[PDB]
Design a protein around this ligand. Structure first.
Ligand SMILES: CC(C)CN(C1([C@@H](O)[C@H](Cc2ccccc2)NC(=O)O[C@H]2CO[C@H]3OCC[C@H]32)CC1)S(=O)(=O)c1ccc(N)cc1
Lengths: 99, 99
């Protein structure tokens, strides 16, 4: 499919038994989700952008369903204002920018 | 052209006759640039990033070239890790997401 950018490119993801709305974000190295429980070990990380930094928990090898695909990768969890799907997962589902 | 997402989508832009590097950022509503000189009058805008809310300077109807494509629109100037090209200009140059 093709996704226009007149509106925020929001999609529904399934992760850890939960459905969440999230932003397809080419600017993001990493995928970042609002507070939730995830399985396995984690380590703390600081990520920064407009407005400064937030502290997040990094989980690896997390299964996600998005855009009819299943992908696996790292998910950061913390006090982000919006759920963000970053390049680490966008690549796995074959998402590209075109113009 | 097609831009894949295995690396950061950093591209050359031109503004005020000068080349700069900017990140194509589908998760940004607005285009936010590193400190620079722009003509005309500006007004404040409050934006909310990952770290919280901040006020930046809004310049309207500014000429800016992105990947060789000429756009004219709003650019915000404020503290950002990198120049980001947001949806307001991504739409002008006919950029979409595809999978
Ligand atoms: C500023 C960029 C260089 C990096 N950030 C982006 C960016 O797309 C954000 C997403 C976002 C949207 C709404 C609310 C909060 C955040 N947009 C953003 O800041 O856009 C601003 C400009 O337009 C406005 O519209 C959305 C918020 C405003 C790439 C992910 S980040 O800070 O989230 C981030 C930094 C580091 C790591 N490792 C992961 C993420």
């Amino acid at each position: 499919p093709q996704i226009t950018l007149w509106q925020r490119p929001l999609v529904t993801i399934k992760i850890g038994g939960q459905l969440k709305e999230a932003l397809l974000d080419t600017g993001a190295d990493d995928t970042v989700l609002e507070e939730m429980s995830l399985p396995g070990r984690w380590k703390p990380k600081m990520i920064g952008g407009i407005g400064g930094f937030i502290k997040v928990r990094q989980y690896d090898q997390i299964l996600i369903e998005i855009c009819g695909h299943k992908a696996i990768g790292t998910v950061l969890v913390g006090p982000t204002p919006v759920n963000i799907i970053g390049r680490n997962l966008l690549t796995q589902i074959g998402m590209t920018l075109n113009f």
